[PDB]
Structures are given as C-alpha cells and as structure tokens.
Design a protein around this nucleic acid. Sequence first.
DNA 1: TGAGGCATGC
Length: 212
Amino acid sequence: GSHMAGAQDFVPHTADLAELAAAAGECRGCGLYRDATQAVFGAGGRSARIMMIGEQPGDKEDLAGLPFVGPAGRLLDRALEAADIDRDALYVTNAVKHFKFTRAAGGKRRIHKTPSRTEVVACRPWLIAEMTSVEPDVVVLLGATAAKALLGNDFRVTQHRGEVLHVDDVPGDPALVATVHPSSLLRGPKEERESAFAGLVDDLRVAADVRP
DNA sequence: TGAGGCATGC
Ligand code: SF4
C-alpha cells in the first residue's frame, strides 16, 4: 500500500481457521500490532452459514482475544436472540484485527480509536481469507467500517441498511446485508435506543431469511 | 463508557 505494507503477504495459503488465526498473531501489515495486546481473529466454524463482520476489537476484545465480548457484544447477543439466530450458525469477526486506541497523557484508560481506511485496506486480506474458508450464504456488515470494507468507501449504511446486496468483487458471491454497529445503539440517545435495537433486529432477520 | 457521516487541520 501507499502508507501501510498490508497484510497480504502475511496470510498463509490455507482455509484452516486455526492456522489463519495463528498467522494473524504474527502480522505486521500495519502499525496496529505494536500497541495491541494480541490479534483478535474471528470466532466460529467453517460450517457457519452467516458471517458477521464488525469494525475492530474494543478494550474487552483486546484483553480476551475474542470478538464481541464487551458492551456492544452483549447488545448483539440480545439481538441475535430476538431474531432466533443460533450462534452455531455464526462466524463472527472484525474488519481490523488489532485494537487501535490512544491514551490521554495524564490518563490510564485506553480510548477506542476508529481504524483508518488505510488500516482497513491493510487488514482486508484476512477478511478475504476468512470469507473464502467459511463460504457463508450471507454476510452481515455491522457498521460503516465493515460495510465500506466490502462495498466501497461511498457506501452508506444509513442509506442502504437492511437491503440484500451482491457485489462481484467478493469471493463466493454471498448475499450482503448492512446494518448499524451495535455500539451505535449505546453511543446514541437513550430514548432512541429501543427503536434502534428493533431496527438492528429487523436487519438481522433479513439476513437470516436469505435462501441460497 | 460503549457510532455515523459530514466537516476542518497540517
Ligand atoms: S490490524 Fe490487521 S493488518 Fe494491521 S497488523 Fe493487525 S492483523 Fe495485520
């Protein structure tokens, strides 16, 4: 890449998810490996028919080494239940595999920082390897960073959420459904939260109803 | 504390 080397040559030629996950722990495709605790690879099995892709680890994901374990993951768990999506059908990952954060000079708390488009493009080869291994029927794009990673920078989740989409550039031609990131339900006003949760559930139901 | 899609800064 122009700013970052990219992950492409760190990605081993394999569909084994465990081998991919170990190799991501050695990735230096961008700068984010340096300050992060560990790579946070996807969770689930190749038999999954629904792949869900978030933005990046948060604080709790970085410490645990698993995706969607913090507050946003708790919300996602409730939305999955409300749509009767069995977790055995899921492979869950993020567009970026190492936690990007900063700290105030006189503070200790790690402050989440949105990955740059540069870092998203650098990390995308891992996502392509995951999609090739899992071959999902449908991909849920949880938020703008993930949706733009596969649908292009001009894509707007608030414009096209809940629509079943297909693009050429994507291995295996799965259906794609974009929605808002579960953390946005928390970031927004408490009085919009109920309607926003119902909207996430409705978008998940669209994805769950995709028939290959 | 935990987005999104516009903007401005260097
Ligand atoms: S964020 Fe992705 S590309 Fe960057 S170092 Fe980590 S695994 Fe590699």
